[PDB]
Design an enzyme around this catalytic site. Sequence first.
Site, PDB file in Angstrom:
ATOM      1  N   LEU A 183      54.404  74.031  54.021  1.00 54.45           N
ATOM      2  CA  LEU A 183      54.607  73.652  52.820  1.00 54.45           C
ATOM      3  C   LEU A 183      54.389  75.275  51.882  1.00 54.45           C
ATOM      4  O   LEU A 183      55.150  75.666  51.047  1.00 54.45           O
ATOM      5  CB  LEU A 183      53.665  72.634  51.730  1.00 54.45           C
ATOM      6  CG  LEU A 183      53.986  71.599  52.461  1.00 54.45           C
ATOM      7  CD1 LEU A 183      52.775  70.405  51.886  1.00 54.45           C
ATOM      8  CD2 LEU A 183      55.427  71.093  52.091  1.00 54.45           C
ATOM      9  N   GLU A 184      53.470  75.784  52.257  1.00 59.95           N
ATOM     10  CA  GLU A 184      53.180  77.182  51.529  1.00 59.95           C
ATOM     11  C   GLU A 184      54.165  78.206  51.973  1.00 59.95           C
ATOM     12  O   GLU A 184      54.746  79.028  51.282  1.00 59.95           O
ATOM     13  CB  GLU A 184      51.764  77.771  51.949  1.00 59.95           C
ATOM     14  CG  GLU A 184      50.662  76.752  51.257  1.00 59.95           C
ATOM     15  CD  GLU A 184      50.840  76.420  49.770  1.00 59.95           C
ATOM     16  OE1 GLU A 184      50.529  77.160  49.237  1.00 59.95           O
ATOM     17  OE2 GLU A 184      50.856  75.268  49.382  1.00 59.95           O
ATOM     18  N   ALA A 185      54.577  78.012  53.324  1.00 63.19           N
ATOM     19  CA  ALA A 185      55.883  78.775  53.781  1.00 63.19           C
ATOM     20  C   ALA A 185      57.151  78.369  53.091  1.00 63.19           C
ATOM     21  O   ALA A 185      57.816  79.354  52.869  1.00 63.19           O
ATOM     22  CB  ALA A 185      55.945  78.516  55.346  1.00 63.19           C
TER      23      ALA A 185
END
Lengths: 247, 260
Positions: free
Chosen positions: A159-161
């Site tokens: 998700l952060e990626a």
Amino acid sequence: NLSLSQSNFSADTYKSFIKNLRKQLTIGASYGSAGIPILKHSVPICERFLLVDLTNGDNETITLAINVEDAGFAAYRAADRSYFFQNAPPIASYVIFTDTNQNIMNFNNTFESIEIVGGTTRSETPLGIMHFEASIFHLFVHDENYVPTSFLVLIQMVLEAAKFKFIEQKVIHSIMDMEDFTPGLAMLSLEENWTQLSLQLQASESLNGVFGDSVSLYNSMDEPIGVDSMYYPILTANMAFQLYQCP
Amino acid sequence: EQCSPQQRTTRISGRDGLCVDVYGALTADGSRVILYPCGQQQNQQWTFYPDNTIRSLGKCLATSALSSGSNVVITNCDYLRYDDGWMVSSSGTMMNKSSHLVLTANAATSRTNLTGENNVFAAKQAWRIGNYVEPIVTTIIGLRHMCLEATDNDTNVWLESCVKNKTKQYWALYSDDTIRVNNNRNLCVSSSTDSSSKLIVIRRCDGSINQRWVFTPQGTISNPGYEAVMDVAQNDVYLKKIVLSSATDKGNGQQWTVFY
Ligand SMILES: *[C@@H]1O[C@H](CO)[C@@H](O[C@@H]2O[C@H](CO)[C@@H](O)[C@H](O)[C@H]2NC(C)=O)[C@H](O)[C@H]1NC(C)=O
Ligand SMILES: *[C@@H]1O[C@H](CO)[C@@H](O)[C@H](O[C@@H]2O[C@@H](C)[C@@H](O)[C@@H](O)[C@@H]2O)[C@H]1NC(C)=O
Ligand SMILES: *[C@@H]1O[C@H](CO)[C@@H](O)[C@H](O)[C@H]1NC(C)=O
């Protein structure tokens, strides 16, 4: 569902996965001057989740439910069992993973909550191939002692990626060189400020692209760069989508 | 409410990393603005308001003529009450809404008066509004997860496998939208100056259109003046050629990442 399997986990397949994840999350997004898509808002519960499958090295698969409004995980399924965060939308259990034995995890889907429950922070949690695989496993069997760190790993690697090209790139490097890493100030500063950057970018429409508040984003040399406008490439060519914040 | 900031004070930097400065901190109407080394002085602090005004020392940045070639100055804001103001593009072009002239450092040296000129998307017409005025050091990642590298004694550029701390793989992103050789900041990535070639190369910085690059949210490195983007020749990194091409969705050669 969009999926990624450890049996075919290369920089190319990871990149494609992230690219597609962004595409799916951005369906129906709005756009402002910056040209960075803004996630949907006020989405009916029956449509609020995007399911993605991750398979480990044992051919064991989990299905994660991502809230399309904020790109966070709300729950996941493993075989005939499902697990929901405490802070998942209250009606989610009637919409996803209905034909499973449902469980509520005693913590929220936020880093702060996860780190408190697990007693370990992101700075001390390695990321990389071994960790991605193991995290899927720990979640598949729901080993309580490893669930929190497993989410720290997957939330960031997935998700952060998706949210930040810089983070995607760190993960790519980790795959290509098979070199694990812990996030440093640069990565953490992005994760920390995603909502704030979303607000400032949107708010800046009325101020010629200038923000109401400055945001500190660190570089790889641990130097803070003040981002007080949309005119920084480390923001505008990095953050892939935003949280809806302003009318 | 946070969605409606009432103002923000910041600096404005551009060509060669210099800052927009009200010369001598003079306040008289018509006091000219120039480029000068960045500092903390009040005459380099610009406050932005929702009325499309940009102010320093209590007065407003403004052009001083309808035609190109005249100085940009500061003047009593009351004289601009019935004026639309400035509009800043997503790429850092600062334009007078009514006349269409843009903030420019036009001379052969950046130690110069700022003027209102016709827009041609030159690097000398590109600005970074923001308090952090320094060049941003980064690697630039492209096809096959490779890195752009300055080659042939800083005259060419192409992709090579990324190597941490390999000097020639580092670029300095300047406030004027130039991409500079990190260890030789007088050299800039430039689109071809020979019409027979589309090859991107490295040349001495000169403020030209050829040297202005915009990192777009869609992942391209765009040359706005030339309505084109950086691309890996034939989508083949082994050709050691990066060229300027019209944007296309065929292949992955037009996608890049900034890794700072
Ligand atoms: C933008 O450009 C316009 C046009 O040159 C400027 O308008 C002139 O403003 C001065 C003072 O208000 C008046 O003497 C002129 O009559 C105006 N001329 C026209 C043709 O409208 C305007 O001031 C500029 N604004 C900024 C912020 O640069
Ligand atoms: C910057 O603006 C001022 C004020 O409008 C101009 O006078 C300057 O012109 C320069 O100085 C005059 C006296 C004359 O020699 C002219 O040819 C010069 O270009 C102008 N330029 C600079 C560099 O100060
Ligand atoms: C979890 O989230 C809710 C907000 O949605 C909040 O009320 C609660 O304080 C948080 N709980 C924990 C366990 O931190």
